[PDB]
Structure 1
Amino acid sequence: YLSQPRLTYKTVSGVNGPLVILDHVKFPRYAEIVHLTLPDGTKRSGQVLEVSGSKAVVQVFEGTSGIDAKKTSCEFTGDILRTPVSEDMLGRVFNGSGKPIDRGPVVLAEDFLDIMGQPINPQCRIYPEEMIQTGISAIDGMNSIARGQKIPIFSAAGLPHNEIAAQICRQAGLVKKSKDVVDYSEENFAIVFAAMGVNMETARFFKSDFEENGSMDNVCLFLNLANDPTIERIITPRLALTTAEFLAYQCEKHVLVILTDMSSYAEALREVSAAREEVPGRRGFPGYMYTDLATIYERAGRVEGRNGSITQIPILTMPNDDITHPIPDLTGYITEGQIYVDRQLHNRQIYPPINVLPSLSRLMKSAIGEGMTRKDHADVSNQLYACYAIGKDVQAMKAVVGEEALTSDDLLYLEFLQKFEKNFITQGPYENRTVYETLDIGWQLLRIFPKEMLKRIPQSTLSEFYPR
């Protein structure tokens, strides 16, 4: 395709902040990638921000420092950013820019793609039709995740959400083994993980843990330490999504993308906007944050005629534990469902501190069902939730009514509360529970009472499951 020699300029009409203005450029185009070479020999990349006649502006990625007026080369590429996607990238580790960092070789690209991606036709959407298992009993049993659902995970500063993310990574998978393990051996599942805006301790911890779990043969990893250039923050997600797309729809696999710390994404985007001199929007965040998060989240689902899917589990932190902060508000609007973690539960030394009372789901009704699972799921979930809500409000009642006036059934509700928080929720970092184990523990916890109190379960399944 491209065959022309590239240009290079020694023109610098000025510099200001993280930008560098030049001119006398022939037929510039927007979003063109630009290299730079300083007097001391360092090489730095960049992108074109502004274009006006023969004037140009380039935001230098690595940060502007020591750029002379007359001694500075500026080569142009003439193409927008393009990713070298390839199936073989699994088992590797990269930085934000895509340069490998695990002592490995440059990726022998199998195909080149546009970093931005393209919108997917709503006509060719396919509704989800089956669940998955994340390895967490609290999440699978109480709140199903379909193929193609977009469930965020709200957390706050000071909670162990990162440990939960690592646990989800090292145990995510499928439950097709309902019928037979022989037909289950056909596994076509992979995970792509995008650590962004992460401090150094957590980056090392992630790398070590992922390497320890022994399933790195199906994990792609992207790291962007908080040291690296702030603009690389808002380029890491695009690379991750392009890779996930190429794997999903060109290899017919089942990919699970997990994004971390979207608050840092928001902050980096804010800084880019403010450097770009644009007028501020609400709360100092730019107006089109909605559109931007939309174009990031909307790349998933299922495609008619392709055997594959993309599931999204973004994570983010709520400043000041404020549920009406814009980032969680917009994230909730665009996405489907929500999962909480609560300070008090972590403060009860319960791991994972997953607060199911305000945790919802949107596709649970259709993710589960006969065949893809047992026939005894939805009623069990309803009963567990109802029992737990009764138990908690009843503890609130006994707090003042006195334990002496309590009925014996009241003690049964308290027993349910304590056992539910002792066994169902608490699992431990490596106790890989399956869905079937989770439902077994659920039935065991339900066995405390007679079927008469269990008024959310149909009698037909009571005659089968309750007397076990």
Structure 2
Amino acid sequence: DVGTVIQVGDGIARAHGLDNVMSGELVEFANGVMGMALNLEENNVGIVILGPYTGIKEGDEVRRTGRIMEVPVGEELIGRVVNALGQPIDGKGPINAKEFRPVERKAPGVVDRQPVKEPLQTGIKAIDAMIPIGRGQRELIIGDRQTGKTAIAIDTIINQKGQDVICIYVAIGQKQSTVAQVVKTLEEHGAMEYTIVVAATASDPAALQYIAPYAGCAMGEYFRDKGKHALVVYDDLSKHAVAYRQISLLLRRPPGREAYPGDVFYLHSRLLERAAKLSDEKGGGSLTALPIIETQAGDVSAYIPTNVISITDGQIYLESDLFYSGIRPAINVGLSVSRVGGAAQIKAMKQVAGKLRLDLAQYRELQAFAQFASDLDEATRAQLERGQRMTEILKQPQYSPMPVEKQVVIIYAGTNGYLDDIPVEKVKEFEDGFLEYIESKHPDILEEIREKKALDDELEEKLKKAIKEFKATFK
């Protein structure tokens, strides 16, 4: 169970001895720092260091712990900020968790699963109506830097207060000032009462940046095995991939496409397949996932992006030209899809917008044609007018989510065509004015839709009678 260090450099070490070490085991240096054995050659063990390595010298002793990589889990982690390992980083004392679980685990099998049929409400009009997310689904947020990727993930976590959901935020490669600002934003909105924050900052050893998403996954699956729903966010998987390239090149493993290793697809596949909706036999639990990716110059075609887009159950693309031109949130409807879309919605939302993505694609195409055609037949004029109104109804400012019962009432009025006379600039004022009138005059419709979760014929007459009272004030 004992060895001696032979090489030390850049957070990587080589040891002699350690005959009984297992692939993936934990090892301790004389300094008290931990390391993980990732290579087992005929004469030398290759060790990845899990902390500061400037105190480890050649000829120092290394000892076998006798345990695989393990992290502590429980409900007591809620409202706490923690390291990639089982250690607190906030000024709030010890964690006192009840049990420990391995960092590497196999995903649920084909028969252990169930189809996704219940929503994960984001409170964002474009995502809930066009790109719906269900509990157990894996959804990707993608774009270049400074496009709103973090804002969509945090707005989603803030919208989980009413529901019986636990959220996990994993920060990989992020700057410490941003982690403190995220934690304080979560505290102002009260989200810290039902969330966990796992952080491995940029100045942290690459080895800890690797383990951060897997440890965040091990903490999420604990709630899922009991029967409770859980959500996990990964702030940058592109920074996790960049981190993975360093130890593999320092351990001298051969490169591949770009300079990344051959195991790059397997890295993110091992992680993202643990997110599932389990069957009634397993307790019906659900682990949802929201990975994030940064792509240079806003190009979809690259090694790390295409690997992850090929693993998830959909994706949300954010475009900087949409952002600089007034479209917020800056989501491109043509490149964004949900592989579970339609089943992950309440019946009222399917009845109201089951065909919105296809219709909003006819208009997106017609924009490129109409600007050079200079001819507009009546059927094209009618679609340009409706498409403009729907693109305005989908705009939404920060930190102001829409409950589903309000989202199905405005989209019902827009898709039925009641907004025909209302001028384009006026639509914004009509939406805000009409939604405030619903919460005043006969609020029965708003409450009845919330309980039933379906639009019937009574709720259609009740609503068609209401939409005509406000329009009677116009020209």
Shift of 1:121: 2.3
Shift of 1:202: 2.2
Alpha-carbon distance change, 113 to 66 in structure 1, aligned in 2, over 3 angstroms: closer
Alpha-carbon distance change, 462 to 248 in structure 1, aligned in 2, over 3 angstroms: closer
Aligned letter for 2:12?
Answer: L
Residues 52-110 of structure 1, C-alpha deviation per residue, up to 9 Å, x if partnerless? 4664332223353354335x443431211111111211111112233211112332221
The answer to whether the 8 A contact 1:412-1:449 is kept is no
Residue ranges of structure 1 left out of the alignment (5+ in a row):
1-6, 175-186, 452-459
What TM-score does the superposition give when structure 1 sets the normalisation length?
0.82
The one of 385, 409, 434 aligned to 2:403: 434
The answer to whether the 8 A contact 1:20-1:57 is kept is yes
The one of 348, 369, 377 aligned to 2:350: 377
Cα distance in 1 for partners of 2:190, 2:222 equals 24
Corresponding residue number in structure 1 for 2:271: 296
Shift of 1:409: 7.0
Corresponding residue number in structure 1 for 2:117: 129
Pairwise mapping of residues 4-403 of structure 1 onto structure 2 (< 5 A)? 11-25=4-18, 27-38=20-31, 43-52=32-41, 55-65=44-54, 67-70=56-59, 72-172=60-160, 187-250=163-226, 252-304=227-279, 305=281, 306-368=283-345, 372-374=346-348, 377-378=350-351, 380-382=353-355, 384-385=356-357, 387-402=359-374
Cα distance in 1 for partners of 2:328, 2:261 equals 37
Q: Matched residues, percent identical?
A: 26
Alpha-carbon distance change, 410 to 13 in structure 1, aligned in 2, over 3 angstroms: closer
SS of the aligned residue for 1:324 comes to coil
Shift of 1:201: 3.4
SS of the aligned residue for 2:67 comes to coil
Pairwise mapping of residues 393-432 of structure 1 onto structure 2 (< 5 A)? 393-402=365-374, 413-422=383-392, 424-432=393-401
Cα distance in 2 for partners of 1:364, 1:394 equals 24
Shift of 1:394: 4.4
Cα distance in 2 for partners of 1:352, 1:210 equals 20
Cα distance in 1 for partners of 2:248, 2:41 equals 19
Alpha-carbon distance change, 397 to 118 in structure 1, aligned in 2, over 3 angstroms: closer
Aligned-residue RMSD, C-alpha: 2.9
Shift of 1:168: 1.3
Shift of 1:410: 5.9
The answer to whether the 8 A contact 1:297-1:335 is kept is yes
Cα distance in 2 for partners of 1:333, 1:22 equals 38
Shift of 1:387: 4.9
What TM-score does the superposition give when structure 2 sets the normalisation length?
0.81
Alpha-carbon distance change, 128 to 225 in structure 1, aligned in 2, over 3 angstroms: same
Shift of 1:258: 1.5
The answer to whether the 8 A contact 2:2-2:18 is kept is no
* Alignment length (residue pairs): 427
Cα distance in 2 for partners of 1:77, 1:416 equals 66
Alpha-carbon distance change, 463 to 106 in structure 1, aligned in 2, over 3 angstroms: closer
Shift of 1:126: 1.0
